[PDB]
């Protein structure tokens, strides 16, 4: 198994949101993406809305 070719763009963070939006939908992708772009870690990331932190009533 492979999957890559040439220098296309290689987004791991991109992933990481993904990962998370299934276990936590509610919350959208820009803003996952940005706090991961912070916490840098799905973990981190969620330990901000398992406990409820980033609100964004959009």
């Known amino acids: ?3 890559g070719s040439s220098g296309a763009s290689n987004s791991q963070l991109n992933a ?3 990962q998370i939006q299934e276990m ?3 919350v959208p992708y820009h ?3 940005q ?3 912070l916490t840098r ?3 981190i990331t969620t330990d901000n809305i ?3 932190r980033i609100q964004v009533p959009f």
Do not use: I, N
């Open 1 to 3: 198994g492979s999957s």
């Open 16 to 18: 990481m949101a993904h």
């Open 24 to 26: 936590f939908p509610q």
């Open 31 to 33: 803003l996952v993406l």
């Open 35 to 37: 706090d991961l772009q």
């Open 41 to 43: 870690s799905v973990e």
């Open 50 to 52: 398992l406990e409820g």
